[PDB]
Design a protein around this ligand. Structure first.
Ligand code: I0Y
Length: 221
């Protein structure tokens, strides 16, 4: 099943890499990334969404602002809230502020989310059919912090204890690397100076490396 390569950037699903700065807001960037993709699918307009709106306002859903949160809680907030503001109307400050949500500037919405079954084959299918997917990974490693090029593979990685929300925008394979040659194409939120222009190729089909298939979901819009 599924194409041998997918890349939602080339279809215009994906906003430029952003930078969460010194705020534990990775979950919000992964969520706005998944939502940006699904709104684009619906409407043909690609609009950067407000991570700050999610940071300040999705407390009721269970999120903890700059201290952490889950993508599904963010999707739940957008639903509960009846909308989400744009990045330009509600810009990123990288700290906890009073919730400033103004429905007058809502440019997005959803009707819940879908959690993907915990298998890479299932992630493959969802990426191929739906668009960018929110995923969490065990990013807690020097080798990840200082990642720059190639297919990321970390022997001590965990498939069960993930700590970092990112966005899978596709998958592929190295004509270079073809032995364990496949990778997920992953949009991170640490600015463009990290990894490959802010992106990382995570090892694909290596028995759920770093837990990339263990917490995948997307908003239904
Ligand atoms: C976000 O950037 C995260 O990475 C954060 C933990 C963390 C690790 C390392 C850093 O340092 C920098 C890289 C420099 C920023 C910062 C923060 N992770 C979360 O927010 C997690 C990850 C996750 C896992 C699975 C699904 C979604 C997201 N969410 C979280 O920590 O969950 C705990 C929780 C919070 C609130 C309520 C209930 C549970």
């Amino acid at each position: 099943e599924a194409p041998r390569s997918v890349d939602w950037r080339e279809k215009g699903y994906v906003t430029p890499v952003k930078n969460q700065g010194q705020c534990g807001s990775c979950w919000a960037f992964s969520a706005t990334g998944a939502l940006e993709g699904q709104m684009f699918r619906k409407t043909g307009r690609l609009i950067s969404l407000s991570e700050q709106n999610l940071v300040d306002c999705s407390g009721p859903q269970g999120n903890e602002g700059c201290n952490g949160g889950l993508m599904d809680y963010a999707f739940q907030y957008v639903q509960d809230n009846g909308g989400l503001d744009s990045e330009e109307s509600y810009p990123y400050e990288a700290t906890e502020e009073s919730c400033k949500y103004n429905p007058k500037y809502s440019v997005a919405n959803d009707t819940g989310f879908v959690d993907i079954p915990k298998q890479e084959k299932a992630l493959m299918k969802a990426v191929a059919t739906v668009g960018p997917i929110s995923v969490a990974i065990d990013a807690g490693h020097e080798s990840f912090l200082f990642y720059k090029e190639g297919i990321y593979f970390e022997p001590d990685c965990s498939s069960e204890d993930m700590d970092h929300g990112v966005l899978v925008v596709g998958y592929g394979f190295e004509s270079t690397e073809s032995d364990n040659n496949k990778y997920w194409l992953v949009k991170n939120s640490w600015g463009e100076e990290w990894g490959m222009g802010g992106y990382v190729k995570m090892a694909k089909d290596r028995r759920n490396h770093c837990g990339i298939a263990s917490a995948a979901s997307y908003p239904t819009v």
